[PDB]
Amino acid sequence: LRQFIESFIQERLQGKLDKLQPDEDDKRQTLLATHRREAWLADAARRVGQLQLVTHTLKPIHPDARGSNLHSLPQAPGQPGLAGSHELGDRLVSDVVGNAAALDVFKFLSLQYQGKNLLNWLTEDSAEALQALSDNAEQAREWRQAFIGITTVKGAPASHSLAKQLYFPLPGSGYHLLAPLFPTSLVHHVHALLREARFGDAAKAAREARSRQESWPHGFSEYPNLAIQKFGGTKPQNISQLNNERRGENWLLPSLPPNWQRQNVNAPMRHSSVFEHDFGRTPEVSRLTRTLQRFLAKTVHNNLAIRQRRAQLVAQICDEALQYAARLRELEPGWSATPGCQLHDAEQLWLDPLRAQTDETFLQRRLRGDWPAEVGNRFANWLNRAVSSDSQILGSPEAAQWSQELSKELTMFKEILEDERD
Amino acid sequence: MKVPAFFAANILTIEQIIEAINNDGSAMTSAPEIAGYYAWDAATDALESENDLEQLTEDDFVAHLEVLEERGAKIDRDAAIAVALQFQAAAVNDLHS
Amino acid sequence: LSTASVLAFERKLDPSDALMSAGAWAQRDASQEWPAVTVREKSVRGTISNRLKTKDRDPAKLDASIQSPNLQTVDVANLPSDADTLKVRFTLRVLGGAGTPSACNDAAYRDKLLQTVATYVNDQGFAELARRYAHNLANARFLWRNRVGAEAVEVRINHIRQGEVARAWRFDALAIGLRDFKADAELDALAELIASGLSGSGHVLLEVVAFARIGDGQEVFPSQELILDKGDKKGQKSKTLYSVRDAAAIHSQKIGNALRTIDTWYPDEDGLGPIAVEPYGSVTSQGKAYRQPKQKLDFYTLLDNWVLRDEAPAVEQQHYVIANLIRGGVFGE
Amino acid sequence: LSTASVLAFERKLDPSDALMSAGAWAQRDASQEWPAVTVREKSVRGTISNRLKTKDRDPAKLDASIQSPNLQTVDVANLPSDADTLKVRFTLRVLGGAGTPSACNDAAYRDKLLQTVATYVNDQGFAELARRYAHNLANARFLWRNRVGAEAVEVRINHIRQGEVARAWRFDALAIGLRDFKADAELDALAELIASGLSGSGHVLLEVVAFARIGDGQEVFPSQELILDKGDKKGQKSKTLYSVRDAAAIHSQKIGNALRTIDTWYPDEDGLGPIAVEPYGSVTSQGKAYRQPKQKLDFYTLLDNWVLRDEAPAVEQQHYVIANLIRGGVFGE
Amino acid sequence: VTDPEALLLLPRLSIQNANAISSPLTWGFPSPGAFTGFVHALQRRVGISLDIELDGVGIVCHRFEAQISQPAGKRTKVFNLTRNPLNRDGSTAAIVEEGRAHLEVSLLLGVHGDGLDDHPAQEIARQVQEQAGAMRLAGGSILPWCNERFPAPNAELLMLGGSDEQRRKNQRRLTRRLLPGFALVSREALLQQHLETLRTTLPEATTLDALLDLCRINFEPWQVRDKPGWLVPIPAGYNALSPLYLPGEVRNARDRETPLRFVENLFGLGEWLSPHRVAALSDLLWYHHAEPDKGLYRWSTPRFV
């Protein structure tokens, strides 16, 4: 293992003593090799207290805030609906924060786990070469007084003004001000997931079969709306270790409400469109109806989950029309009947502008409103048209159950529809 | 003391640094003093209390200079280190009056 | 006795986005219906006209350099071909409680600070600063490039306490000097409105609307948005513009820059005029920072003298210290 | 003692997008409300005509590909079948104050620049340049291909001091030449209008309207846009045009390219017509760059010799250095 | 988690330049901890003067406009930054990245105090909105109204008394004024459900959210895996990684009279819902709750099911 130590140093010979300068080789050819037997292992003995290994770093919050980079791991929370870096356990890539001109010391102390375990035993296996390591004999006692010290943290509880210190209120008590850190290992575990789950060996395999349509059982992922957050800017390796796949980026997961990048310039209704009457024929509704058509209503082989998922699906459409109603109601005060009316009866009565007034000359209906249900029945006549084709459902009571699904959702729909005019 | 010219321009990125030394630097500057000032600027930022500018040797100038070599950016070793020592020597005459 | 290791201040004079819409001059009175200036894409082919290296500029590859011209899809915002007046509006509010920090370690430092700020106001209120902030609402400083070359610029500063307008102001921004801070009857009526807002608590809401005769179909300048990493050199949308709800608009931090361009107390040169109030007072257009620590006119160097060791600066420099407390900031150890 | 690392000049002579609309000739005041020239599509299939690469020069290789078609959709803009006249309308706004950069690092370089520019102005005004820009409004140089093959071109130039019109100009654009720079009293009366606007003395806003008899149902040419190279089968679209509100339009900088075609001061051969004022003054169609930096006549060599080390260029060449400050640019990259 | 007496409504709060990073992993709509800390700032400023308890908060989010752009050829979307003032030497400034999003939310509240019996209903709603105008919600400003003056007034429903008919017709009046939005709740039980479902392998809790921020195009035994709702990742709270310090032994604190722990974030699951889906609107509230003995500092919607 001494030879395995020194072959690493033979690489450190060959990595550094490679381009001999013809002017200053007198130290570079001669002195640079002489320390590399034992004194280089004593050169790094004074070079332990200049680097630290951290699970959590502070510098991504602001790249100059001097803080306390830490290494501890969370406990189990207790409610298993949560998720943090306590789920990792063994796969911990603790990115060392420190000077770039000394990180080979951490590459040197990586030689504990390489092959043999030897992690917690920097206190034994001292003198000899093969089964021990021959970090040499008399100096195998004051080196371990130093080289263990990179594993522990520098002991100072400190923060900075640029470190996002947050109050948190207590049950019937004062405040703990919480300083959240940046979980580097939890981020780097997701880069190990997302680079694999997008494009790898098996990920490209199922993608190539899309043209082939030859389904061996293996799913492939797809992650829309990822966000790139960069750190360090023009200088990424001056902060925590940003690797060759995490090159100063964080893939961020989207957390967005469904009314994102919607139709901001709201297109009006009452035109020659044959669909846009009572349900909002939009690409967010057309993708929803085909789910009910192509399965879960036509392909029925169960009463537990099949009958269940038909119930909330029309409860979506009962409220999606209400979403469609209020967007058409809001930000359109100048709605009227005169542009393009051929079959749009009572659409002036239901999705009206309230105007804080009535506008009527040869008519009384505009002053008030009672039972706007015929457009809801036409919506209910659309819900019978919403399912495409199913001929084997009429003899079964499934369409009779679906008629009850049609009936129990209009009953909610009519009562909601009252107070816009009642 | 000493000021650059390709820097203090429009806001740069790492990919726009690498394309400069892949050329002969840029207009009004040179590929030595771009990678040299970058190696000095990356070294001078990492200090703890910034009262230790005298602790900046030649070795940590190289360690930041090799970051560009990891991603393209064929540089000159002897030129960029000498430029990085110019800004370092300029950053101590102001410290002593 | 010592500096507080954490100091932070919220900003007062909190503006909003500056939406744009175009219409006809003398139709300003019914300008609640003007259609918004939209952001339009266009392609543009240029040639290379930068400086060249000495390794370059041989006549062989220069002619080959213009054989492959650069192409790019830029964004432009223009008036319609019949309109001639840009309307830019925003809702500035004036919060108040100026000298109160938002975070501070040492309570002994904090009470020493609150006695120092109340020493200022009792000696002289915010009316010196609020006369100066009123000019940047009077002249159209918040129209950065939109002001240049206009026929007439008119600013209509209303006031809001309810749906009813309390008091309306009218101005001519071109007659009001861009470099001078001269008082007036209407300005001092608006100045003491601001100084009453900054002193007491509770916000004093405003509504500033600006008009400018530009031309028919001419170009306006919304704030250019900062794309960090543009992608491949095929699409390559250079010069993206800021737009909110399909209306070309100016960033709030650009409007908020122009309200506080009142540093008339330089050590070196006041020939550039009143520029922005900054700690280590810097100008992005000039490319270098005035008020250096080699001078004794920092924000930090003036603050700890005037707070800890009671070295009060010049009375003019006392106005500079309060103005950084109005814009906010996160301070050191 | 050295050039700044940031030099940026806001452009002067800022035109709008030229709108095209069509009608009949001998309509003077009826030309206010023409129908606009719209952009429409058509199918286009035309066989192989490119130079083969000497590998594809087999009879079996052409005949396999001379049969394989290349169905493409293009955009075209045509006049109506009862209209022979194209009206092209835009607005030009002369700003003035050409010497001042919008941003500069070295104030000593800035003050040296502002004295060197002011050395030009008091010796001789803008009236040499302003006479040359007035001709490019007079003849329809901004009609690039639409001018070629016309009966007669009539250019009407209004000056709108307010919403009303101060003075109207009328020109026969074919009687006024395209290469030489003639002399006329009406051209002078528009020359010192621009000279009064380039010097910042007054305010210049212009309305430029160009009529051109082409023929019934003929083709006009808006500025072509950029298509995205896509690997789509069954053909694609191969030419897109420019229209702001379904009305075929010329870009703003295509007009501005044609206004500054005043440069008759080459090293090589001045008897070839003027071209656009550019640093390393180059023609995209000709494919070569006139005024090579191997000669000491480009903008960057003439500038710093006349600014930093203070030898004047020829007065014949001083107009080119000032004309790059009127177009603006991004100098000192 | 106390059952609210009243339900104060902040009608349409337009929010300029809010934060959008919200966690180290989940970009988008800002954290629900920002909303629960906002109501505690109103309880700091107003609720001790009107003698009321402002604890719960609902999230409606009528409009979300982020300042993002995808670059040319990519499919991921990067952020829009802003300039900063220059350095001491005036060379340039360092780049920090901050997400930025315009926002239009509505906030249900919960009231417990005796000030309902003392002050009238309009006096409660007037003192809150006049305070909440000059404040910040997610690190960004709050904007007033102009040019149509419709959505300005508040609402308040004393949902403690009355028969179940008198609640339910009155409850349908708030769902009118909350209709263009999408209500937000936490689903802590579905994440516990699918971990116990995925036991063919030995996965983790963090490996489940990656299978819920999904387009799992499943190959045929082609097809796309179904979603029972608009499931989305949220930050659930905090989890401490340090022992609990004395107030005066951590350098560079905010104040030197409160204890400190260094924490992580803590990721959970959330679903966006229409307001007519939920039966009782008091189930919609977000309550911060924490046991300080161990390191949990979380927030959730309890009593939801």
CSV table of C-alpha atoms in Angstrom, one decimal, chain D residues 31-333:
chain,number,residue,atom,x,y,z
D,31,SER,CA,-53.4,59.7,-51.0
D,32,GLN,CA,-54.2,60.0,-47.3
D,33,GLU,CA,-56.4,56.9,-47.1
D,34,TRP,CA,-55.1,54.4,-49.5
D,35,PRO,CA,-55.6,50.7,-48.9
D,36,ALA,CA,-52.3,49.2,-47.8
D,37,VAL,CA,-50.1,46.7,-49.6
D,38,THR,CA,-50.7,43.4,-47.9
D,39,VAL,CA,-48.4,40.4,-47.7
D,40,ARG,CA,-49.8,37.2,-49.3
D,41,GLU,CA,-48.5,33.7,-50.1
D,42,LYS,CA,-48.2,31.7,-53.2
D,43,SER,CA,-46.8,28.3,-54.2
D,44,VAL,CA,-43.5,28.2,-56.1
D,45,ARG,CA,-41.9,25.2,-57.8
D,46,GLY,CA,-38.7,25.8,-59.8
D,47,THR,CA,-36.2,23.2,-60.9
D,48,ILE,CA,-32.4,22.9,-60.3
D,49,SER,CA,-30.2,25.7,-61.5
D,50,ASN,CA,-27.2,25.9,-59.1
D,51,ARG,CA,-23.6,25.1,-60.0
D,52,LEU,CA,-23.1,21.4,-59.6
D,53,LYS,CA,-20.0,20.3,-57.5
D,54,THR,CA,-18.6,18.1,-60.4
D,55,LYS,CA,-19.7,15.0,-58.4
D,56,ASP,CA,-23.4,15.5,-59.3
D,57,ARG,CA,-22.5,16.0,-63.0
D,58,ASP,CA,-23.9,12.7,-64.1
D,59,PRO,CA,-26.9,12.4,-66.5
D,60,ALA,CA,-28.6,9.8,-64.3
D,61,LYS,CA,-28.0,12.1,-61.2
D,62,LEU,CA,-29.6,15.2,-62.7
D,63,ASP,CA,-32.5,13.3,-64.3
D,64,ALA,CA,-33.2,11.7,-60.9
D,65,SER,CA,-33.2,15.1,-59.3
D,66,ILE,CA,-34.6,17.1,-62.1
D,67,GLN,CA,-37.8,15.1,-61.6
D,68,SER,CA,-37.8,15.3,-57.8
D,69,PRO,CA,-39.6,18.6,-57.1
D,70,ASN,CA,-38.9,21.5,-54.7
D,71,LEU,CA,-42.4,22.9,-53.9
D,72,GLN,CA,-41.9,26.0,-51.8
D,73,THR,CA,-44.2,28.7,-50.5
D,74,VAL,CA,-43.0,32.3,-50.7
D,75,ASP,CA,-44.4,35.6,-49.5
D,76,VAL,CA,-45.2,38.2,-52.1
D,77,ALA,CA,-46.4,41.8,-52.0
D,78,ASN,CA,-48.2,43.1,-55.1
D,79,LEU,CA,-50.2,46.2,-56.0
D,80,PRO,CA,-53.9,45.9,-56.7
D,81,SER,CA,-54.9,45.4,-60.3
D,82,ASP,CA,-56.3,48.9,-60.5
D,83,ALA,CA,-53.4,50.6,-58.8
D,84,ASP,CA,-50.1,51.5,-60.4
D,85,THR,CA,-48.6,53.8,-57.7
D,86,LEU,CA,-46.8,52.8,-54.5
D,87,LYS,CA,-46.9,55.3,-51.6
D,88,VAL,CA,-44.1,54.9,-49.1
D,89,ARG,CA,-44.4,56.9,-45.9
D,90,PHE,CA,-42.1,57.3,-42.9
D,91,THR,CA,-41.1,59.9,-40.4
D,92,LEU,CA,-37.5,61.1,-39.8
D,93,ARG,CA,-36.4,62.8,-36.6
D,94,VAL,CA,-33.1,64.7,-36.7
D,95,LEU,CA,-31.8,64.9,-33.1
D,96,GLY,CA,-28.5,66.8,-33.0
D,97,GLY,CA,-25.6,66.9,-30.6
D,98,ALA,CA,-23.4,64.4,-32.4
D,99,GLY,CA,-20.1,64.8,-30.5
D,100,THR,CA,-21.3,63.7,-27.1
D,101,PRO,CA,-21.1,59.9,-26.4
D,102,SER,CA,-23.8,58.2,-24.4
D,103,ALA,CA,-21.1,56.4,-22.4
D,104,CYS,CA,-17.3,56.9,-21.9
D,105,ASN,CA,-14.8,55.7,-19.4
D,106,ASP,CA,-11.9,58.3,-19.7
D,107,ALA,CA,-13.3,61.8,-19.1
D,108,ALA,CA,-10.0,63.2,-20.4
D,109,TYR,CA,-10.6,61.2,-23.6
D,110,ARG,CA,-14.2,62.5,-23.6
D,111,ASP,CA,-13.2,66.2,-23.2
D,112,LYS,CA,-10.5,65.8,-25.9
D,113,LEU,CA,-13.2,64.3,-28.1
D,114,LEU,CA,-15.7,67.1,-27.4
D,115,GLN,CA,-13.1,69.8,-28.3
D,116,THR,CA,-12.0,68.0,-31.5
D,117,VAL,CA,-15.6,67.7,-32.6
D,118,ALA,CA,-16.3,71.3,-31.7
D,119,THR,CA,-13.1,72.2,-33.7
D,120,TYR,CA,-14.9,70.8,-36.7
D,121,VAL,CA,-18.2,72.6,-36.1
D,122,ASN,CA,-17.1,76.2,-35.7
D,123,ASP,CA,-14.7,75.9,-38.7
D,124,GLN,CA,-17.5,74.5,-40.9
D,125,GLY,CA,-21.1,73.6,-40.1
D,126,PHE,CA,-23.0,70.4,-40.9
D,127,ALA,CA,-24.2,72.0,-44.1
D,128,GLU,CA,-21.8,69.9,-46.2
D,129,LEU,CA,-23.2,66.7,-44.6
D,130,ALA,CA,-26.7,68.2,-44.5
D,131,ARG,CA,-26.6,69.0,-48.2
D,132,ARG,CA,-25.7,65.4,-48.8
D,133,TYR,CA,-28.4,63.9,-46.6
D,134,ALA,CA,-30.9,66.2,-48.2
D,135,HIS,CA,-30.3,64.7,-51.6
D,136,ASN,CA,-30.9,61.2,-50.3
D,137,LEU,CA,-34.3,62.4,-49.2
D,138,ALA,CA,-34.8,64.1,-52.5
D,139,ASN,CA,-34.1,61.2,-54.8
D,140,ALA,CA,-35.8,58.0,-53.6
D,141,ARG,CA,-32.6,56.2,-52.4
D,142,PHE,CA,-34.7,54.6,-49.6
D,143,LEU,CA,-36.7,52.9,-52.4
D,144,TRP,CA,-34.1,50.2,-53.0
D,145,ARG,CA,-35.6,47.9,-55.6
D,146,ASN,CA,-39.0,49.7,-55.9
D,147,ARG,CA,-37.2,52.7,-57.5
D,148,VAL,CA,-35.8,50.5,-60.3
D,149,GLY,CA,-38.0,50.7,-63.4
D,150,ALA,CA,-40.5,53.4,-62.6
D,151,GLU,CA,-42.2,56.0,-64.8
D,152,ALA,CA,-41.6,59.0,-62.5
D,153,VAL,CA,-41.0,59.3,-58.7
D,154,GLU,CA,-42.4,62.1,-56.7
D,155,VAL,CA,-41.1,62.8,-53.2
D,156,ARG,CA,-43.1,65.0,-50.8
D,157,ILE,CA,-41.4,66.2,-47.6
D,158,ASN,CA,-43.4,67.9,-44.9
D,159,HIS,CA,-42.0,69.5,-41.7
D,160,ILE,CA,-44.4,69.2,-38.8
D,161,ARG,CA,-43.5,71.8,-36.2
D,162,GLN,CA,-46.7,70.9,-34.3
D,163,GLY,CA,-49.5,68.7,-35.4
D,164,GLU,CA,-49.8,71.2,-38.2
D,165,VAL,CA,-47.3,71.4,-41.1
D,166,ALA,CA,-44.7,74.2,-41.2
D,167,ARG,CA,-43.3,73.8,-44.7
D,168,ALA,CA,-43.9,71.3,-47.5
D,169,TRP,CA,-41.3,70.2,-50.1
D,170,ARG,CA,-41.9,68.8,-53.5
D,171,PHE,CA,-39.4,67.0,-55.7
D,172,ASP,CA,-39.1,65.1,-58.9
D,173,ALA,CA,-36.8,62.4,-57.8
D,174,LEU,CA,-35.7,61.2,-61.2
D,175,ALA,CA,-34.7,64.7,-62.4
D,176,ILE,CA,-32.5,64.9,-59.3
D,177,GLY,CA,-29.6,62.5,-60.0
D,178,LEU,CA,-28.6,59.4,-58.1
D,179,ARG,CA,-24.8,59.6,-58.3
D,180,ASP,CA,-23.9,63.3,-58.4
D,181,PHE,CA,-24.8,65.9,-55.8
D,182,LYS,CA,-26.5,68.8,-57.6
D,183,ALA,CA,-27.4,72.3,-56.4
D,184,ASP,CA,-30.9,73.8,-56.0
D,185,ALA,CA,-32.6,76.4,-53.8
D,186,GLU,CA,-35.3,74.1,-52.5
D,187,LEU,CA,-32.6,71.5,-51.7
D,188,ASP,CA,-30.7,74.2,-49.8
D,189,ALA,CA,-33.8,75.2,-47.9
D,190,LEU,CA,-34.1,71.7,-46.7
D,191,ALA,CA,-30.3,71.5,-46.1
D,192,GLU,CA,-30.1,74.3,-43.5
D,193,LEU,CA,-33.2,72.8,-41.9
D,194,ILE,CA,-31.2,69.7,-41.2
D,195,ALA,CA,-28.1,71.8,-40.3
D,196,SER,CA,-30.4,73.7,-37.8
D,197,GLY,CA,-31.3,70.3,-36.4
D,198,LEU,CA,-27.9,68.6,-36.5
D,199,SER,CA,-26.4,71.5,-34.6
D,200,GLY,CA,-29.1,71.3,-31.9
D,201,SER,CA,-30.4,74.8,-32.6
D,202,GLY,CA,-34.0,73.8,-33.2
D,203,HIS,CA,-36.3,70.8,-33.5
D,204,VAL,CA,-36.6,68.9,-36.8
D,205,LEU,CA,-39.3,66.3,-37.4
D,206,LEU,CA,-40.0,65.4,-41.0
D,207,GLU,CA,-42.7,63.4,-42.9
D,208,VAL,CA,-41.3,61.7,-46.0
D,209,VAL,CA,-43.7,60.4,-48.6
D,210,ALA,CA,-42.5,58.8,-51.8
D,211,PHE,CA,-44.8,58.0,-54.8
D,212,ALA,CA,-43.7,55.7,-57.6
D,213,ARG,CA,-45.6,54.7,-60.7
D,214,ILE,CA,-44.8,51.0,-61.3
D,215,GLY,CA,-47.8,49.5,-63.1
D,216,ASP,CA,-51.1,47.7,-62.6
D,217,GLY,CA,-50.7,44.7,-60.4
D,218,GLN,CA,-46.9,44.7,-60.4
D,219,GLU,CA,-44.6,43.6,-57.5
D,220,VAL,CA,-43.2,45.7,-54.7
D,221,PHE,CA,-40.4,44.7,-52.3
D,222,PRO,CA,-40.6,45.0,-48.5
D,223,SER,CA,-37.6,44.2,-46.4
D,224,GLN,CA,-37.1,40.4,-46.3
D,225,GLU,CA,-37.1,38.7,-42.9
D,226,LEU,CA,-35.1,35.7,-41.6
D,227,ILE,CA,-36.4,32.1,-41.8
D,228,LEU,CA,-35.3,29.4,-39.4
D,229,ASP,CA,-33.5,26.5,-41.1
D,230,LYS,CA,-35.6,23.5,-40.3
D,231,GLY,CA,-35.5,19.9,-41.6
D,232,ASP,CA,-39.1,19.8,-42.6
D,233,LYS,CA,-40.3,17.7,-45.5
D,234,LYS,CA,-42.9,18.3,-48.2
D,235,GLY,CA,-41.3,21.6,-48.8
D,236,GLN,CA,-41.1,24.7,-46.6
D,237,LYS,CA,-41.3,28.5,-46.7
D,238,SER,CA,-38.4,30.2,-48.3
D,239,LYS,CA,-39.0,34.0,-48.2
D,240,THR,CA,-40.8,36.0,-45.4
D,241,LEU,CA,-41.5,39.7,-45.7
D,242,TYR,CA,-42.1,42.4,-43.1
D,243,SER,CA,-45.4,43.9,-42.1
D,244,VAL,CA,-46.3,45.5,-38.8
D,245,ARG,CA,-50.1,45.5,-38.9
D,246,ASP,CA,-50.8,43.4,-42.1
D,247,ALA,CA,-49.3,46.1,-44.3
D,248,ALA,CA,-46.0,45.4,-46.1
D,249,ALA,CA,-43.2,47.5,-44.6
D,250,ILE,CA,-39.6,48.4,-45.0
D,251,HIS,CA,-37.3,48.2,-41.9
D,252,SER,CA,-36.2,51.3,-40.1
D,253,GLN,CA,-32.5,50.6,-40.6
D,254,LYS,CA,-32.9,49.9,-44.3
D,255,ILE,CA,-34.1,53.5,-44.7
D,256,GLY,CA,-31.3,54.6,-42.4
D,257,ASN,CA,-28.8,52.6,-44.5
D,258,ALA,CA,-29.9,54.6,-47.6
D,259,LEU,CA,-29.9,58.1,-46.0
D,260,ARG,CA,-26.1,57.9,-45.2
D,261,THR,CA,-25.0,56.9,-48.7
D,262,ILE,CA,-23.0,60.1,-48.9
D,263,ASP,CA,-19.5,58.7,-48.8
D,264,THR,CA,-17.7,59.8,-52.0
D,265,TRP,CA,-14.2,59.9,-50.4
D,266,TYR,CA,-12.6,56.5,-51.2
D,267,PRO,CA,-9.0,55.7,-51.5
D,268,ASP,CA,-9.6,53.6,-54.6
D,269,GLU,CA,-12.0,55.2,-57.1
D,270,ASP,CA,-14.4,58.0,-56.2
D,271,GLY,CA,-16.0,57.8,-59.7
D,272,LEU,CA,-18.2,54.8,-58.7
D,273,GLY,CA,-21.0,56.5,-56.7
D,274,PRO,CA,-21.5,57.0,-53.0
D,275,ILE,CA,-21.9,54.2,-50.5
D,276,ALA,CA,-23.0,53.9,-46.9
D,277,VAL,CA,-20.9,55.6,-44.2
D,278,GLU,CA,-19.4,52.6,-42.3
D,279,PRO,CA,-16.3,51.9,-40.3
D,280,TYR,CA,-14.2,49.9,-42.8
D,281,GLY,CA,-16.6,51.3,-45.4
D,282,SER,CA,-17.9,48.2,-47.0
D,283,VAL,CA,-20.6,47.1,-49.5
D,284,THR,CA,-22.5,43.9,-48.9
D,285,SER,CA,-23.5,43.5,-52.5
D,286,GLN,CA,-20.1,44.3,-54.0
D,287,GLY,CA,-18.6,41.9,-51.4
D,288,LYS,CA,-15.4,43.9,-50.9
D,289,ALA,CA,-14.5,46.4,-48.2
D,290,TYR,CA,-13.5,49.8,-49.6
D,291,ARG,CA,-11.3,52.0,-47.4
D,292,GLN,CA,-9.0,49.3,-46.2
D,293,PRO,CA,-7.1,49.7,-42.9
D,294,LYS,CA,-3.9,49.0,-44.9
D,295,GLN,CA,-4.6,52.5,-46.0
D,296,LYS,CA,-4.7,55.1,-43.3
D,297,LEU,CA,-8.3,56.1,-44.2
D,298,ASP,CA,-10.7,54.0,-42.2
D,299,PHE,CA,-12.7,55.5,-39.2
D,300,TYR,CA,-10.5,54.1,-36.4
D,301,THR,CA,-7.2,55.3,-37.8
D,302,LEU,CA,-8.5,58.7,-38.8
D,303,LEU,CA,-10.1,59.2,-35.3
D,304,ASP,CA,-7.3,58.6,-32.9
D,305,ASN,CA,-4.8,60.4,-35.2
D,306,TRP,CA,-7.1,63.4,-35.0
D,307,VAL,CA,-8.0,62.9,-31.3
D,308,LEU,CA,-5.1,61.3,-29.4
D,309,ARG,CA,-1.9,62.4,-31.2
D,310,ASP,CA,-3.6,65.4,-33.0
D,311,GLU,CA,-2.8,65.4,-36.7
D,312,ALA,CA,-5.8,66.5,-38.7
D,313,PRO,CA,-6.9,64.3,-41.7
D,314,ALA,CA,-7.9,66.0,-45.0
D,315,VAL,CA,-11.0,68.2,-44.9
D,316,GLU,CA,-12.1,65.9,-47.8
D,317,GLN,CA,-11.9,63.1,-45.2
D,318,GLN,CA,-13.0,64.9,-42.0
D,319,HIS,CA,-16.7,64.6,-43.1
D,320,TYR,CA,-16.5,60.8,-43.0
D,321,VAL,CA,-15.2,60.9,-39.4
D,322,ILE,CA,-18.1,63.1,-38.3
D,323,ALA,CA,-20.6,61.1,-40.2
D,324,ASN,CA,-19.8,58.0,-38.2
D,325,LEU,CA,-20.7,60.0,-35.1
D,326,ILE,CA,-24.1,60.7,-36.5
D,327,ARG,CA,-24.9,57.1,-37.3
D,328,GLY,CA,-23.5,56.2,-33.9
D,329,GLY,CA,-21.9,52.9,-33.1
D,330,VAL,CA,-20.3,50.7,-30.5
D,331,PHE,CA,-16.7,51.9,-30.6
D,332,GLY,CA,-13.7,50.8,-28.5
D,333,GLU,CA,-14.7,47.2,-28.1
